[PDB]
Design a protein around this ligand. Structure first.
Ligand SMILES: [Cl-]
Ligand SMILES: [Cl-]
Ligand SMILES: [Zn+2]
Ligand SMILES: [Zn+2]
Lengths: 369, 351
């Protein structure tokens, strides 16, 4: 009610029914440069956050930096599937089996389990057949095959490749902290749905990982000499952008986003409503005030995915990233339909949040909340 | 100032999501006894308003002649799972009023029970009007429109006398002026009210209080008698109010007449508790009402919080509440059988 005392604690996405507030959801977001400097924020941009599957490009880097993995001949689409929370479409299952074959492993070697598909259409096909998904159907199956590959390549057991004491998980933990530029004690660890260790760290550092992806892609495309790590980051970016259907699937936000942007960015979902985007240097990033790549990370405090995709699409519009025509491929996510059982629209979504970082009285405190 | 009351989920002790909780616990006159969050938050009651809409139906002149029974009234109060038995009862109620499915003005939707919906998907079933979770309410409004000789084609429109009756009855049960109730449109295409959350608790306290007064042989107005009947119908036929496995059904079965409870979509909940040792211990001499809203709309968190609140209020025994253990602490087990996290209730009741 007072535009001059607005605060991070008031950064919301709200749904209404005939103008009456239905639900409200707190938003947190960080927009960072290629070194992690914070450029813009919503909510608490340093919120300690479970990255969930948005950490997968970092886990893929740990796989690709494992000595001997290159000999298996994983291609870009295989790397994309390592980075994926796929919809368990037949092509994802088939590629998982092909990756198994490249390392001479079997489905029984996987330590992830089946689950209902992340795609409603795939799940409808499974329901019709009373199909029970198995390990090879896991949305994380590509990451698991990559972890198996790394365990085999260094001569570790494949037994227990998913456990924290295994050297593959030691490599993951170190790689995540290094990409975030954190000490190990500033990264916390739980266990994911796919039964791997999964990291939590300040939300802005998830943005920093993705800014580093995009920055590495810029350096590779420009022909700059790169470290082995930067070359591997550039390869991960390229793989995701070239095979975005491996990263998610038909009708999925990550796939539709990356297809619409045609190489300009990569993006990835984390469960419980986190999202991360790495944006290559562009006219839009320069207008935001940086000379290199950019990273964006978002968390919806209560975990609602429909709201996450609406907010991410709104934030891209506010940041001037893309064109209206590019972002219009995402219109169904930006303003989710609210049509009742008789075809009547009953309400909608609104975005009463305010990006900070672009000028207010110096006496307005922005308390991260 | 409202407290900062949350339910919080974790993964290995690391915070995953948090959800703001609003709750009101009120006496039979609506006086606020305990609260979480903002107990007066303006809130869409959604289907938690259905007992008030059922009252408007039952008070309509001539509706008694159709011979609706207790299970029919329960289905008027329902957000049912569209099980075959709910559809069958909808058709039986249509027949009682000499109407047809084509007269309904609600539409089909995926079932509120995931198990039912999977069964529909396997069979390529397209739900129709008679499968609406609100089908019983719609048959009741048809019945009221026909009973007073109003048109049936537009019984769902705000300008129809049945909707005028509903709008008046809701404000009267809330003890609000008409202008203090706001109205939107529900999923089933009826007008749907919003009012302060504590007033939703007040409606359910009046249900339970009427059940107590009928049980006790008090001189009741026709309205209190009808409220008592609604309470009794819900408690006697809780499977009509929701369905197998649903929180409302399991809650009411566990309590065996001691309370009624009802879900509103987007995570509101209302309970009417008959006077008991537990209510007297809370400091009231009559019935009480409980209303809850999860700010972000998460249903799993709603049922966890409602069950936690019952435990904090002492309502029921530990043995009775243990039937709801699966809702109180939702399972957090991964695809390989490993427990990955849990739910916590850092909130504190304000008295
Ligand atoms: Cl919402
Ligand atoms: Cl949650
Ligand atoms: Zn995983
Ligand atoms: Zn309805």
């Amino acid at each position: 009610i007072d535009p001059f005392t607005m605060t991070p604690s008031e950064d919301f996405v709200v749904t209404d029914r005939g103008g009456i507030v239905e639900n409200s959801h707190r938003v947190h977001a960080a927009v960072v440069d290629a070194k992690g400097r914070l450029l813009y924020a919503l909510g608490n941009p340093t919120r300690m956050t479970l990255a969930r599957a948005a950490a997968k490009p970092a886990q893929a880097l740990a796989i690709l930096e494992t000595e001997g993995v290159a000999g298996y001949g994983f291609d870009d689409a295989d790397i994309a599937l390592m980075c994926a929370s796929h919809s368990s479409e037949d092509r994802h299952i088939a590629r998982t089996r092909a990756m198994l074959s490249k390392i001479k492993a079997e489905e029984a070697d996987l330590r992830c389990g089946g689950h209902p598909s992340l795609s409603e259409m795939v799940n409808r096909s499974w329901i019709k057949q009373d199909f029970i998904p198995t390990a090879v159907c896991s949305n994380c199956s590509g990451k698991h095959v990559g972890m198996l590959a790394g365990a085999r390549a260094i001569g570790a057991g494949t037994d227990g490749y998913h456990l924290p004491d295994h050297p593959m998980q030691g490599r993951v933990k170190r790689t995540v902290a290094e990409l975030c530029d954190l000490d190990a004690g500033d990264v916390e660890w739980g266990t994911d749905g796919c039964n791997l260790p999964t990291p939590a760290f300040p939300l802005d550092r998830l943005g920093r990982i993705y800014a580093k992806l995009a920055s590495a892609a810029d350096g590779s495309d420009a022909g700059e000499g790169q470290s082995t790590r930067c070359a591997a980051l550039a390869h991960i970016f390229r793989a995701m952008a070239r095979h975005p259907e491996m990263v998610a699937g038909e009708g999925r936000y990550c796939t539709m986003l990356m297809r619409a942007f045609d190489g300009a960015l990569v993006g990835k979902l984390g469960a419980d409503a986190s999202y991360a985007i790495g944006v290559r240097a562009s006219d839009a990033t320069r207008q935001l005030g940086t000379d290199g790549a950019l990273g964006i990370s978002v968390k919806i405090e209560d975990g609602n995915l429909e709201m996450l995709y609406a907010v991410v699409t709104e934030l891209l519009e506010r940041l001037g990233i893309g064109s209206p025509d590019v972002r219009s491929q995402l219109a169904s996510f930006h303003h989710p339909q609210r049509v009742n059982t008789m075809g009547v629209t009953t309400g909608g979504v609104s975005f009463p949040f305010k990006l900070r970082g672009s000028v207010d009285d110096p006496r307005l405190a922005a308390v991260a909340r």
